[PDB]
From a paper:
We conclude TTYHs are not pore forming subunits of anion channels and their function may involve Ca2+-dependent changes in quaternary structure, interactions with hydrophobic molecules near the extracellular membrane surface, and/or association with additional protein partners.
To test this, we purified and reconstituted [name] into lipid nanodiscs without Ca2+ and in the presence of EGTA to maintain low free Ca2+ concentrations for structure determination. We also pretreated filter paper used for EM grid blotting with EGTA to sequester the high residual Ca2+ known to be present in this material to prevent Ca2+ transfer to the [name] nanodisc sample. The Ca2+-free [name] cryo-EM data did reveal a change in oligomeric state, but surprisingly we identified two different conformations in approximately equal proportions: the expected monomeric [name] (to 4.0 Å resolution) and an unexpected head-to-head homodimer (a “trans-dimer” to 3.9 Å resolution) in which [name] protomers embedded in separate nanodiscs associate via a buried surface at the distal end of each ED. Protomers within monomeric, trans-dimeric, and cis-dimeric [name] adopt overall very similar conformations (pairwise protomer r.m.s.d. = 1.3–1.5 Å) with conformational changes largely limited to subtle rearrangements of side chains. The pocket and unassigned density is similarly observed in [name] cis-dimers, [name] monomers, and [name] trans-dimers, suggesting it may be a conserved site for binding small molecules or extended and primarily apolar lipid headgroups. Notably, reported human TTYH1 and [name] structures determined in Ca2+-free conditions are also cis-dimers, while we observe monomers and trans-dimers of mouse [name] prepared in Ca2+-free conditions here. For dissociation of cis-dimers into monomers, these include: (1) the affinity of TTYHs for Ca2+, (2) the related dependence of TTYH oligomeric state changes on [Ca2+]ext, and (3) the range of [Ca2+]ext experienced by TTYH-expressing cells under different conditions.
Author numbering: 34 to 73, 89 to 414
Write the structure that this text describes.
């Protein structure tokens, strides 16, 4: 989690040091074997080579699987970023255009109707429920902070996946090079280089066991964290957003509550009233100047655009797409990363066994 001292971190560290103790017992087993063989057949080497080839292959499969999983997680985060960015742009544009509409309505009324000054009550009415609409739309949840934190998480996971991809392909390359130099030493007469590469192989064994440790730690941590993630997302993020909206988004396979149809109804009725009053101004604009009629027709098309924007908005608030993105992210984390990372754990175990067998076949050369 966030702090550096708790049971979860201690549990993961205990698993890691248990794997390190496994590495230690492996190395002391190697030491006792070497001292026993210094105190006073091709089948095993062939089996070791086949096992190490199978290990590196299954590890490459696991790394590709986790690469694909992280890639689709980043894709889902990108879709969520796009959706919230579109929501934010739509709401900001609607507010900005509404303010512009208020100011231009004030201008066109002062230009013409100020001479008569009889529909001042109507003008005050439009002003008052326009302000009511502004207040009601101010109640929508702004999505700037979630976009910022999700972009930060996307950057972090991109960096982490790039680092892991590079490091583990380095590990695959090193394993292949060790296999090739083993074959070359088997064929060509053993030079001192076969005595030099023994320490390199031992260090690579140590690295493989450390990989097993970190792999098991990450696997258990991620599995436990995404077993019931909803509580974690509520705790870490649900501070400036009320719990009901978060629970709606995280769990809306059915229409649980959806406590926002009142807002859509009030905007729809406000806009219908706006259409009615605009039509009233048109039908009072017959004896007036054509400039008033042109402005009114422009306002009518403007209201049409506002209505279609509101329809796009209410399409975007519906939790189908966001819930689909969440479910895709959840499955791509657990059901993909866990399995790939476990396959990588089997990689580490099999590679450790393979190095053990090669060291078993080490001293017998000379
Ligand atoms: C979603 O991910 C994209 C990553 O491609 C990021 O979008 C950000 O949105 C801004 C606009 O608000 C974009 O600005 C773009 O960059 C040029 C740079 O000169 C700018 O002048 C233009 O206005 C152009 O639209 C840009 O794609 C990006 N901003 C950055 C990278 O600083 C962002 O991570 C996410 N979008 C959000 C959070 O709105
Ligand atoms: C903004 O949208 C409104 C409606 O959404 C439109 O203004 C006028 O709307 C009425 C009612 O929909 C239209 O009357 C109907 O026209 C159809 C055309 O096929 C006709 O079949 C019906 O019997 C009825 O008469 C009216 O035509 C329409 N005004 C214009 C100029 O088309 C219009 O889409 C937008 N208002 C503008 C551009 O001023």
């Amino acid at each position: 989690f966030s702090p550096g001292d708790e049971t979860y971190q201690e549990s993961l560290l205990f698993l890691g040091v248990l794997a390190a103790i496994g590495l230690g017992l492996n190395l002391i087993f190697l030491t006792v074997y070497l001292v026993c063989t210094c105190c006073c057949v091709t089948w095993t080497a062939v089996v070791a080579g086949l096992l190490c080839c199978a290990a590196v292959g299954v590890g490459f499969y696991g790394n590709s699987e986790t690469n694909d999983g992280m890639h689709q997680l980043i894709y889902s985060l990108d879709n969520a970023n796009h959706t919230f960015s579109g929501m934010d742009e739509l709401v900001s544009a609607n507010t900005q255009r509404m303010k512009v509409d208020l100011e231009q309505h004030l201008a066109r009324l002062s230009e013409i109707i100020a001479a008569r000054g009889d529909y001042i009550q109507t003008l005050k009415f439009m002003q008052q429920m326009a302000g009511n609409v502004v207040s009601q739309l101010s109640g929508l949840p702004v999505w700037r902070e979630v976009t910022t934190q999700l972009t930060k998480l996307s950057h972090q996971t991109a960096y982490v996946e790039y680092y892991r991809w590079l490091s583990y392909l380095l590990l695959f390359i090193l394993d292949l090079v060790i296999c090739l130099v083993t074959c070359l030493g088997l064929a060509r007469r053993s030079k001192c280089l076969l005595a030099s590469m023994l320490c390199c192989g031992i260090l690579t064994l140590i690295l493989s066991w450390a990989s097993l440790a970190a792999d098991a730690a990450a696997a258990v941590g991620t599995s436990d964290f995404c077993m019931a993630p909803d509580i974690y997302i509520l705790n870490n993020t649900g501070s400036q957003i009320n719990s009901e909206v978060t629970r709606y988004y995280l769990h809306c396979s059915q229409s649980l509550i959806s406590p926002f149809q009142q807002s859509l109804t009030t905007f729809q009725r406000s806009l219908t009233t706006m259409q009615i009053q605009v039509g009233g101004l048109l039908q009072f604009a017959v004896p007036l100047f054509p400039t008033a009629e042109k402005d009114l027709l422009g306002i009518q098309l403007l209201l049409n655009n506002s209505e279609i924007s509101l329809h796009q908005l209410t399409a975007m608030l519906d939790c189908r797409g966001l819930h689909k993105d969440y479910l895709d992210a959840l499955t791509g984390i657990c059901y993909d990363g866990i399995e790939g990372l476990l396959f990588l754990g089997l990689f580490s175990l099999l590679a450790a066994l393979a190095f053990s067998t090669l060291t078993c076949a080490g001293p017998r050369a000379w």
